[PDB]
Amino acid sequence: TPSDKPVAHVVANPQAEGQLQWLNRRANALLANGVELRDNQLVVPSEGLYLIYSQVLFKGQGCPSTHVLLTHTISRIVVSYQTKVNLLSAIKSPCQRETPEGAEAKPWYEPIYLGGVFQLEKGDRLSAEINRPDYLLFAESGQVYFGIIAL
Amino acid sequence: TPSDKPVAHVVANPQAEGQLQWLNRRANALLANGVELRDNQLVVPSEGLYLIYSQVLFKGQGCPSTHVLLTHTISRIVVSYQTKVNLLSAIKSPCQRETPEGAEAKPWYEPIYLGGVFQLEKGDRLSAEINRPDYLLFAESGQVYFGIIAL
Amino acid sequence: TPSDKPVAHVVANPQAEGQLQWLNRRANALLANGVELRDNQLVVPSEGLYLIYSQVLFKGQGCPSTHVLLTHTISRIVVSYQTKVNLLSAIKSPCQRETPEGAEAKPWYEPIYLGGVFQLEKGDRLSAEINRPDYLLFAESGQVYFGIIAL
Amino acid sequence: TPSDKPVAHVVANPQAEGQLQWLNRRANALLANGVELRDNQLVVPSEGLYLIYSQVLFKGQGCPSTHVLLTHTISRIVVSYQTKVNLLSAIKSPCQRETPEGAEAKPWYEPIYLGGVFQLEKGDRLSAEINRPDYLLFAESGQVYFGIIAL
Amino acid sequence: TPSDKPVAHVVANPQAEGQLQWLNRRANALLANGVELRDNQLVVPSEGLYLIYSQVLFKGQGCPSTHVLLTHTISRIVVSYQTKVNLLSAIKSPCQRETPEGAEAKPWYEPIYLGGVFQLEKGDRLSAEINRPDYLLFAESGQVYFGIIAL
Amino acid sequence: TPSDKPVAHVVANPQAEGQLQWLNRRANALLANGVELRDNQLVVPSEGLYLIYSQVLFKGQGCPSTHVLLTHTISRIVVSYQTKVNLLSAIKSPCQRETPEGAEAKPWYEPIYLGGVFQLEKGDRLSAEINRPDYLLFAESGQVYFGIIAL
Known part of the structure; x- marks a missing residue:
């Protein structure tokens, strides 16, 4: 805040090497006038049309x-109705089988983006899930983030 | 829905063989105030600030x-100048041959996400199209989006 | 209608070799409400919250x-700290072997889209920095764009 | 009209990227007597036998x-027994190897016309679709068409 | 109350190995008002002008x-000259050269649409025949069949 | 003879190697009840919905x-639009890179079937043509023909 829009910006924390933990207070981010984080997911107050967006870069x-x-997805956790309801997802399998016999591994880089404004509710917890946590580049800021914005 | 804000979230119609038919009344289909779902392309309600986003899961x-x-292209054919002046575009390339005979199936997934803000006036057509719909992933509901939101 | 909001949306110069010369004064390209294009850097007039976005489609x-x-690194330069703070960072690597000896050169295509909302101060300048302005494609509308909008 | 019997002749929209579209208002494009196309489908508005015909020409x-x-698969998704029962169908093989190389690529013009008598109902949807939209001769009207006539 | 106009449209036996038995009923198969299938022929009820359509599809x-x-023919064996006159017939060659020993290969597909309108009499046996019954395709709905309609 | 119907079914003129002449007064020449035939054109009386059709078997x-x-094109001239206009056209590509060397030239067969209803009127001349008669096959049961019908 400034601007009265419950908005989040949760940059991935680079500490526990092998899982992925969303973090606030990582330089510049947002968790104001409504928007809060609990257990690996952002809890949406009131309801509405929130713009969702999560980035993840797979360092090879x-x-x-x-x-x-x-596999990069963003799940929704509803208050009345619950569990694993797929709001949006994506996929892209890394390298086409080279088995490093020659010039083995001069890195490979696959970043994925997810975005769309959706209809949410009170206490609606949205989370950015990953399939293979063991590949995220940590020489970042913008390589891995997750945010929601009020409309 | 909240306010008079022209929102419109559409997915791809699985039952539209070799054609990207944009469909509503799905998992999170938003049909706002003046949002008109015509012949695939979107008609603008009021005027001004509109956010156009779209993802395309090109699977293989x-x-x-x-x-x-x-490729994945988004163009606007307006009133006044009735012709399709491009907005957004993108071309991704999966196939770097590989085609080995003795393996054959190299499951590629190369999605194309897009998003930008445009002028769009009253009485426009928003054309969201691709060149090869044969490679369309209809597995998840968060497979494809077409979206507008006035600000 | 135009809203009372700062929003910029520039397209890279169709005619300008090896430089990301963001161009305004175009048809469906926007440059409005206080936010202009100064030093080839997108400069903002207000503060609070801002939607930052840009994609740079490559080819070789x-x-x-x-x-x-x-690499696609969207940075923020402030009137106080005056240093570059990377906001939107990402890496793309298009060839993990190829060297097309007997086939001249297969022209790969790779789009990099960075987008997130941030908290920016008055008078700050924005830049859609790119390491290899050698491979961008200008035969577009929206192959290379940049945009901001305060919310 | 002359005749009051349901006659609909809809020719292909030549500016629909990677998708076969059907429109009227062209050459001799008569979508008269109760027969209307809602969403790229021809809806028979009455009981009775109709002559169904359609052709597609492949470029390449x-x-x-x-x-x-x-594949030119003319079908009917009946509203009563809610299943898309193909009425017509066509699978064609383009070349006996070639794989251009040396004598680098020449066109392979291929016509695919289907027609037959079918008894229908009210609200019945008629399907045209082609699996290969990236191979259409959209230079000439009259070689890409859909049409039904009542008897 | 559909119509009281003599009509027939028999599809081929989906379970009859390498032949061409004609079945009324089957899918969306028609036969009504005198029209009847005898010793696998479209025998005529009453005299008049009738539309004759018979398309086949070959797989190999x-x-x-x-x-x-x-090759595919339609002959009119009647009552006077009840010896079979080549009502309508043509020829198509799928093979100029291949003899695929360099693999075993992939198949070929070739559709053949026959149609016209004739002046036939009471009790005319219209026979649609293929010289090589092996090459067909029951991997359809409407690929192979016969049909006539009164006027 | 029966039912006043604008019908025509005509074959070729086998007695002219270099031509394109339709001969009335053949095996089954259904040029009656109102239709005419003059300068290789089927003359349209009355006015109304006319299902036109023509097929040609090219041999070489x-x-x-x-x-x-x-090629194969069905064309018309109307009292109103006095000019040869395109109704129904079709193209077919028969040889690629065969042009013999090894053995003697092996026979390719190319049948060209087309049809479709349009709004024909009184004084309308319809022309059934091709590109080059130099490949027209004699054994015309239903090898080379043209015909019209109305509703």
Whole structure:
């Protein structure tokens, strides 16, 4: 705040190497006039038409022996009705099988974006889930973030 | 819905063989005040500030031939000047041949997300299209979006 | 209707070699309410909350020698700290082997879209920095864009 | 009208990217007597037998990787027994190898016309669709059409 | 109350191996007002002007040698000259050259639409026949069949 | 004879190697009850819905050195729009890179079937043509023909 819009900006925390934890107070972010964070998800007050958006960048270390599959989704947790309801998702499986025999792993980089304004409710907790946590680039700021904005 | 704000969230019609038919009355279909779902393209209600966003999950179960070129374009054909002047565009390229005979299925997923703000006046057509709908993922509901929101 | 809000939306100059010369004074491209385009940097007039966005579609006819690497870094320069603070950071790597010996050069395509909302102060300047302005595609409308809007 | 029997002749919108669209107001495009196309489907508004016919012509220039299988599948999704029962269907094979290379690509003009008598009901939706939209001869009106006549 | 105008439209036996038995009923298969299927023929009720349509689809893996060249006819065996006159017939060759030993290959597809309007009498046997009954396709709804309609 | 119907069904003139003449007074020449035939044109009386149709079987023992490109167009001249206008056209590509070397020129067969109803009127002349008669096949049961019907 300034501007009266419950808005969030939750930059991924770079501490626990292998999971992903959303964090506030990481330089510049937002968790004001309504918007709060609890357990790996942002709880939406009142209700409304909120713009959702989460970024995740998959830092590579070569080409593991298989088609790993990458999956970036943003789930919704409703108050009345609950559990795992898919509001929006995406996928992109890394490297096409090279098995590093030659010039092994000069990194690979696959960033994914998700966005859309949706109809939410009071206490509606939205969360950005990942399939393979073991690949996120931590030489960031903007490489991994998650935010919601009031409209 | 809150206010008189022209919102419109549409997905792709699974039952529209080799054609990206934009559909409502789904999982989070928003039809606001003056939002008109015509022949795929969107009609602007009032005027001014409009946010246009769209994701396209170009999925593939193996990589075929040459240079892929899966594009995703958003153009506006207005009143006054009745012709389609582009807004947004994007082309992603999965296939870097690989096509080995002896493997064949190289499950590629190369999504194309877009988002920008435009002028859009009263009585416009918002054309959200792609060049190869055969490679359309209809697995998740957060598969494809078309969206408008006046500010 | 125009809203009482600062919003910028520039398209990279169709005619300008090797530079991201954001261009205004275009048809469906916007540059309004206080926010202008100064030093080839998007400068803001107010404060509070702002929606920052930009995508830079790349192309290189052929997959050359070693990791070319690509990065899209949206930074904020303030009238007080006067240092660059990276807000939207991301990396793209389009060829993990290719060297098309007997086929001249297969022209890969790779779009990088960075977008999030931030808390910015008065008089701050915005820049959609790019390391390799060698591979951008100008035969667009929206292949390379930049936009802001306070909310 | 002359005749008051339901006659609908809808020709393909030549500016619909990667999708076969049907419109009227063209050449000899008569969507008369109760027959209306709501969403790229022809809705028979009465009981009775009708002559259903439609043709599609495929462009293509330079035969690719084997079997694209152009499919012109004329169908009916009846409102009573809510299932999309194909009435017509057509699978065609474009080339016997070629894979241009040396004598680099020439067109392979292919006509696909279907027609037959079918007894229908009120509100019955008629489907045209083609799986290969990226191969249409949208230079000439009269070689891409849909039409039904009552008897 | 559909119509009281003699009409027939028999599809081929979905379970009859390498032949061409004609079945009324089946899918959206028609036969009404005198029109009847005898010894696999469209025998005429009463005299008049009738529309005659018979389309077939041929399926075959690899395009051999020889030059089998699939053909399809419609003959009018009646009462006077009840010896069969070539009502309507044509020829199409799927094979110029292949003999696919370099794999075993992939198939070929070839549809053949026959149609016209004739002056037939009471009790006329109209016979639609394919010289090579092996090459067909029951992987349809409406690929292979016969049909007539009164005036 | 029966039911006053603007009908016509005509075959070719086999007695002219280089031509395109439709001969009335053949096996089944249904040019009666009102229709006319003059300068290779089916003369349209009354006015009304006329389902037109024509098919041509092109034959050739191997292909000459180049892209021959066979066609087939159904055209009309109306008292109002006094000019040869395109109603129904179709193109077919028969040879690629066959132009023999090995063995003698192997026969390709290309049937061209088209049809579709339009609004025809009194004084309308309809022309049934092709590109080059040099590939027209004699054995015309239903090899080469043209016909009209009305409703």
